[PDB]
Design a protein around this ligand. Structure first.
Ligand code: NI
Ligand code: NI
Lengths: 269, 268
């Protein structure tokens, strides 16, 4: 099992210097604390100089293990299930650009809010549209790997649980799509989190950790012990990525507290 | 990767009934033999009835993966590098209509002979005119995807190799344009076909197969084994389309032989 840190970056649109500054600050922080990789989130990769990012990654010996895409939905309204097929196509085209970046870094592409919501429709239709978009993404890419992140009810009404995602993976039928489980979201949506992770098993490709209040792991009341016992049981050996609010005490303090909590859990199994 | 069959169809401006007849026959053959999709070529799309083509594709559960455009050049003299700007504009407008048809099917649009020849000009002038026309196409169409097919020296003096095409793709700078590599043309123009395909890599968007004599794969001396080893190595998961003479033994026998040859290479 490896540890990574999600770093927040300003949109490069906008303020290219701020994006670069944020990225370097976050990566230097991750390296200093001891993380083995970083995870990023970008709205539109077409406006970032990725050759410069590669140089930074090489300088710090810090791979980028995953790329989030949710700002494509929140800022730009792009959805893989949008009722307007024109926007659906634009969403697929945007995510293809994320996969081009992912290929440079060997990173996973996260399918979170970019999948879109039910918007008054049946779950069944929303699911069918989603599966069609994912199959198109697989046809459009030769190497990209995707992970679906179930999100809680306040963020979406489409794919709230690990079981929701597993049903979809069975329909897509590709080993290039797996599951990203997130402890903050699971704390709300999953009945029994160890049982949910056992059901995911080999399909668990990536893991987000934050405590119950989405603070650094250790600063709420989430039972990480049972979770890491289960991760060992199912042989999980990929990334555990800290995705938390900069609390308590700021981005640096939170990253340090998270790392310490997680290191102790990992080494004692 | 997936197998498709190129089917020849009559010009429907000349005989619309013959076009439909040719198309149905070709698609029924493709489905019968086991192909997963078909590929067609039309001179002028604005005179064909595509709704029906769609309901024909529907009832056979048989996608159309690519649309050829070369007859717009061979028959109508339309070229994306024509020195006459008025004809060049008409060529662009024709290809835009091809993209509207392609969008109905999620198909690729092939840029082969429609790109035109040097016609006494420098390679550089011809190339920049081409890039301009391609950028105009990208402006006039939103989702269309184009594939440039390098052709051998007897067919054109403009874009003969995969490396040619790659250099031009870099100048166009759009993931909406890629490469169609053809084994008959490559057998003449490429030094080392596996090395050329590896350089193309992810920019290899579509693939044409015919043997060295352009007969059904298996009926000449082209090394398909090394090609398919390479396609597997690079993770090619797109279409391999049979584009061959109806030889030996006619369109049906050639389609059968080609499928048998290629399926075995893909499976193993
Ligand atoms: Ni998360
Ligand atoms: Ni060809």
């Amino acid at each position: 099992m490896k540890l990574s840190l999600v770093i927040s970056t300003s949109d490069a649109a906008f303020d290219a210097l701020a994006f670069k500054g944020d990225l370097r600050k976050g990566m230097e922080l991750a390296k200093r604390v001891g993380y083995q990789a970083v995870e990023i989130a970008v709205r539109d990769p077409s406006i970032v100089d990725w050759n410069e990012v590669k140089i930074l990654s090489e300088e710090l010996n810090l791979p980028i293990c995953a790329i989030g895409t949710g700002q494509a939905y929140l800022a730009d309204g792009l959805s893989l299930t949008h009722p307007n097929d024109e926007i659906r196509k634009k969403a697929i085209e945007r995510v293809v650009k994320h996969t081009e970046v992912a290929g440079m870094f060997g990173a996973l592409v996260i399918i979170g809010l970019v999948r879109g919501r039910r918007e008054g429709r049946s779950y069944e239709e929303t699911e069918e549209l989603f599966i069609e978009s994912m199959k198109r993404l697989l046809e459009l890419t030769e190497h990209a790997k995707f992970v679906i992140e179930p999100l809680n009810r306040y963020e979406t009404d489409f794919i709230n649980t690990i079981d929701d995602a597993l049903r979809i993976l069975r329909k897509i039928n590709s080993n290039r799509v797996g599951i990203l489980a997130d402890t903050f979201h699971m704390n709300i949506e999953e009945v029994n989190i160890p049982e949910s992770l056992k059901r995911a098993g080999e399909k668990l490709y990536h893991f987000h950790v934050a405590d119950s209040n989405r603070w650094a792991p250790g600063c709420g009341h989430f039972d990480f012990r049972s979770v890491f016992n289960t991760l060992k049981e199912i042989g999980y050996n990929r990334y555990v990525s800290v995705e938390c609010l900069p609390l308590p005490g700021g981005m640096e303090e939170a990253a340090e507290i998270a790392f310490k909590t997680l290191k102790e859990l990992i080494i004692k199994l």
